[PDB]
Design a protein around this motif. Structure first.
Motif, PDB file in Angstrom:
ATOM      1  N   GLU A 197      45.858  27.374 -68.071  1.00 11.55           N
ATOM      2  CA  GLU A 197      46.007  26.058 -68.674  1.00 11.55           C
ATOM      3  C   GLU A 197      44.643  25.402 -68.846  1.00 11.55           C
ATOM      4  O   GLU A 197      43.604  25.954 -68.475  1.00 11.55           O
ATOM      5  CB  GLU A 197      46.927  25.178 -67.827  1.00 11.55           C
ATOM      6  CG  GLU A 197      48.165  25.883 -67.328  1.00 11.55           C
ATOM      7  CD  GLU A 197      49.265  25.914 -68.361  1.00 11.55           C
ATOM      8  OE1 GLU A 197      49.359  24.959 -69.157  1.00 11.55           O
ATOM      9  OE2 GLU A 197      50.035  26.895 -68.381  1.00 11.55           O
ATOM     10  N   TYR A 198      44.660  24.199 -69.413  1.00 11.20           N
ATOM     11  CA  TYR A 198      43.437  23.440 -69.605  1.00 11.20           C
ATOM     12  C   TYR A 198      42.961  22.863 -68.274  1.00 11.20           C
ATOM     13  O   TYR A 198      43.671  22.878 -67.265  1.00 11.20           O
ATOM     14  CB  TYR A 198      43.657  22.320 -70.620  1.00 11.20           C
ATOM     15  CG  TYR A 198      44.258  22.782 -71.927  1.00 11.20           C
ATOM     16  CD1 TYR A 198      43.451  23.220 -72.968  1.00 11.20           C
ATOM     17  CD2 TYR A 198      45.632  22.780 -72.122  1.00 11.20           C
ATOM     18  CE1 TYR A 198      43.995  23.641 -74.163  1.00 11.20           C
ATOM     19  CE2 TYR A 198      46.184  23.201 -73.313  1.00 11.20           C
ATOM     20  CZ  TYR A 198      45.362  23.629 -74.329  1.00 11.20           C
ATOM     21  OH  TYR A 198      45.908  24.050 -75.518  1.00 11.20           O
ATOM     22  N   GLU A 199      41.730  22.353 -68.278  1.00  9.48           N
ATOM     23  CA  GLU A 199      41.199  21.713 -67.083  1.00  9.48           C
ATOM     24  C   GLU A 199      41.920  20.413 -66.755  1.00  9.48           C
ATOM     25  O   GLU A 199      41.866  19.964 -65.606  1.00  9.48           O
ATOM     26  CB  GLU A 199      39.701  21.455 -67.248  1.00  9.48           C
ATOM     27  CG  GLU A 199      39.348  20.592 -68.446  1.00  9.48           C
ATOM     28  CD  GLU A 199      39.094  21.408 -69.698  1.00  9.48           C
ATOM     29  OE1 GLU A 199      38.645  22.566 -69.574  1.00  9.48           O
ATOM     30  OE2 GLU A 199      39.349  20.894 -70.807  1.00  9.48           O
ATOM     31  N   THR A 200      42.593  19.802 -67.732  1.00  5.82           N
ATOM     32  CA  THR A 200      43.318  18.563 -67.476  1.00  5.82           C
ATOM     33  C   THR A 200      44.635  18.805 -66.754  1.00  5.82           C
ATOM     34  O   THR A 200      45.033  17.989 -65.918  1.00  5.82           O
ATOM     35  CB  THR A 200      43.580  17.820 -68.785  1.00  5.82           C
ATOM     36  OG1 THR A 200      42.447  17.959 -69.650  1.00  5.82           O
ATOM     37  CG2 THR A 200      43.825  16.348 -68.513  1.00  5.82           C
ATOM     38  N   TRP A 201      45.320  19.904 -67.060  1.00  5.00           N
ATOM     39  CA  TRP A 201      46.592  20.236 -66.422  1.00  5.00           C
ATOM     40  C   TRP A 201      46.303  21.118 -65.212  1.00  5.00           C
ATOM     41  O   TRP A 201      46.087  22.324 -65.345  1.00  5.00           O
ATOM     42  CB  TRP A 201      47.523  20.927 -67.411  1.00  5.00           C
ATOM     43  CG  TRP A 201      48.970  20.710 -67.121  1.00  5.00           C
ATOM     44  CD1 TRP A 201      49.684  19.570 -67.333  1.00  5.00           C
ATOM     45  CD2 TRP A 201      49.885  21.658 -66.560  1.00  5.00           C
ATOM     46  NE1 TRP A 201      50.987  19.748 -66.943  1.00  5.00           N
ATOM     47  CE2 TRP A 201      51.135  21.022 -66.465  1.00  5.00           C
ATOM     48  CE3 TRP A 201      49.767  22.982 -66.133  1.00  5.00           C
ATOM     49  CZ2 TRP A 201      52.259  21.664 -65.957  1.00  5.00           C
ATOM     50  CZ3 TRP A 201      50.883  23.616 -65.633  1.00  5.00           C
ATOM     51  CH2 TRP A 201      52.113  22.959 -65.549  1.00  5.00           C
TER      52      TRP A 201
END
Ligand SMILES: *[C@@H]1O[C@H](CO)[C@@H](O[C@@H]2O[C@H](CO)[C@@H](O[C@@H]3O[C@H](CO)[C@@H](O)[C@H](O)[C@@H]3O)[C@H](O)[C@H]2NC(C)=O)[C@H](O)[C@H]1NC(C)=O
Ligand SMILES: *[C@@H]1O[C@H](CO)[C@@H](O[C@@H]2O[C@H](CO)[C@@H](O)[C@H](O)[C@H]2NC(C)=O)[C@H](O)[C@H]1NC(C)=O
Lengths: 196, 138, 195
Positions: free
Chosen positions: C120-124
């Motif tokens: 996943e992305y660094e935000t999730w």
């Protein structure tokens, strides 16, 4: 007829904008109606924009709009002599095309702790979504920006206050919207302020 | 041992799952536009919400079951692919909701399929989030 | 005649599924491996004729259980399927969250960063995955080893009144209060408070 009918999104809101064509008189008003992606036959007309000389009309809060589904809008030039045919707009899906805005940083300081709680002005009725914000903190002459890890909405970013001289420290924030794909906003205007 | 309620992790769905649901809805819309308009009305009518917790869990369970049935039937014909992640998350969410519920205590099919496909995003994002906030029946 | 694989496990940290197994006591020659996963009531060959003794299954969804199944093959000949079940949302473990410790005077400030999912992305992060999430912290003076536990409500924690010129070692971990499942105590970081 309005030549450039465009449905865009700014600051968590949906705006239908248009500029008109030459030759029309200066007494023309504008009538605007919105259509959802399902049941395309329906052409609900927006009351707040009805017969308004304004060239911009909000779309986020309407009679019945499913921000989940796509929707488009149409505009027409209405004059006492005659009414131009409607000019439609390209489809827009809110949750996949909403443009976020930076928050307002409510600055509370302790003897050694500074809080950068983010406050947002979200539309009265919109789908709840991720609102993590990144905080950039620096000095008036340092130039290099200290970027803090993202924190969810409702969580103050916490900055340790190392004792030093009173300097003009500057702060800013950026909204990260990650419903299905991270959509970063722009860094707000720095809230430069003296710190003792 | 009976299964505990683990609905708390459905508040924020996986971004890739939501992207897959968006792609699936886009493919369904393309299929509907290619063949022409459908006579039966399939407007995504609003579902009246209630403050009751167990009723909300039952309603989200019914929606999950109906959506899973429709999407699985459509996937059997392979009309549109990419329903894998959606189908498995629907099965998992339905299993967890049913476990929590048990532990605590002449319209054409085409318009119905269109309605459930359109409301899939709302069910995954809105109703499931409220159900997760609700927890087990009080 | 081909011996089946032994000691098959699914190591999944931060939803980084890797199925591993132990090679068997084949008499000689080459013994390859073949691993599949059940999907829609038919097994899909994730790995075929691989020399390695492990294969990653992070491609599979983090929602819903799965059935993993690997055998050993000797050229044309083959061995019996060895199969396990794996529920990523429940059988995974939470890695050590990142730590940012800063000590000033007699006060230690603590910032916790949630473990990240590699797909996943660094935000999730894992915090978003397990919404009902909490941070646990244990600290102790060096050598004393008296685990004092503090559970911050947010990603920041301020320990106060530290006896100067004595090192304090702290660790953080991700707790899930609803299911009562702890993560992994982060590396014990030791800070010497300023005089
Ligand atoms: C930092 O800013 C956030 C901004 O959201 C503050 O969180 C907000 O706090 C207010 C209370 O002061 C909450 O309002 C309450 O909402 C509930 C519904 O959840 C309602 O029933 C109550 O009557 C009340 O209006 C608000 O929900 C909450 N928002 C979020 C996103 O948490 C927070 O208090 C500020 N301070 C700190 C230290 O975080
Ligand atoms: C508004 O609409 C007009 C007409 O469609 C656009 O005018 C064209 O702009 C492009 C820009 O590259 C030119 O190449 C064309 O020659 C223009 N005329 C036509 C008839 O296409 C205009 O760009 C649109 N936007 C704005 C801001 O005016």
């Amino acid at each position: 007829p309005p030549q450039n009918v465009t449905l865009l999104s700014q600051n968590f809101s949906v705006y239908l904008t248009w500029l008109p064509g030459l030759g029309n008189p200066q007494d023309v008003t504008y009538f605007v109606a919105y259509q959802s992606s399902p049941t395309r036959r329906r052409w609900r007309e927006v009351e707040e924009c009805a017969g308004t000389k304004e060239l911009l009309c909000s779309m986020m809060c309407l009679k019945k709009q499913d921000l989940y589904n796509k929707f488009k809008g149409r505009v027409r030039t209405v004059s006492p002599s005659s009414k131009s045919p409607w000019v439609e707009s390209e489809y827009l899906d809110y949750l996949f095309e909403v443009e976020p805005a930076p928050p307002v940083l409510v600055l509370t300081q302790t003897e050694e702790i500074l809080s950068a709680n983010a406050t947002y002005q979200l539309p009265p009725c919109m789908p709840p979504l991720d609102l993590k914000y990144e905080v950039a903190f620096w000095k008036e002459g340092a130039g290099n920006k200290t970027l803090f890890p993202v924190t969810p909405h409702g969580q103050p970013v916490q900055i340790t206050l190392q004792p030093a001289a009173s300097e003009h420290h500057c702060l800013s924030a950026r909204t990260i919207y990650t419903f299905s794909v991270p959509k970063y906003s722009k860094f707000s205007k720095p809230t430069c302020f003296l710190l003792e | 041992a009976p299964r505990r309620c683990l609905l708390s992790h459905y508040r924020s769905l996986e971004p890739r799952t939501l992207a897959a649901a968006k792609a699936l809805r886009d493919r369904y819309e393309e299929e509907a536009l290619s063949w022409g308009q459908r006579n039966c009305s399939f407007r995504p009518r609003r579902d009246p919400p209630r403050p009751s917790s167990c009723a909300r869990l039952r309603h989200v369970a019914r929606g999950i079951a109906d959506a899973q049935a429709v999407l699985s039937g459509l996937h059997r014909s392979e009309l549109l692919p990419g329903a894998g992640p959606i189908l498995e998350l629907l099965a998992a969410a339905g299993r967890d909701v049913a476990a929590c519920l048990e532990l605590a205590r002449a319209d054409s099919p085409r318009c119905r399929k269109a309605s459930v496909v359109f409301n899939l995003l709302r069910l995954l994002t809105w109703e499931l989030r409220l159900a997760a906030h609700s927890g087990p029946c009080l | 005649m081909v011996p089946p694989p032994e000691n098959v496990r699914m190591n999944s940290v931060n939803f980084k599924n890797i199925l591993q197994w132990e090679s068997p006591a084949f008499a000689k020659g080459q013994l390859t491996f073949t691993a599949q996963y059940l999907s829609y009531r038919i097994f899909q060959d994730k790995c075929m004729q691989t020399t390695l003794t492990e294969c990653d299954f992070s491609s599979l969804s983090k929602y819903g259980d799965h059935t993993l199944r690997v055998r050993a093959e000797f050229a044309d000949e083959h061995s019996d399927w060895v199969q396990i079940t794996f529920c990523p949302v429940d059988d995974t473990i939470i890695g050590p969250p990142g730590m940012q410790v800063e000590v000033l005077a007699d006060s230690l400030h603590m910032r916790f960063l949630a473990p990240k999912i590699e797909n996943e992305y660094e935000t999730w992060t894992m915090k978003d995955m397990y919404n009902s999430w909490t941070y646990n912290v244990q600290y102790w003076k060096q050598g004393t080893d008296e685990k004092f536990q503090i559970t911050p409500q947010y990603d920041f924690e301020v320990l106060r009144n530290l006896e100067p010129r004595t090192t304090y070692c702290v660790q953080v971990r991700g707790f899930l209060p609803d299911r009562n499942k702890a993560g992994e105590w982060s590396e014990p970081v030791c800070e010497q408070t300023t005089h």
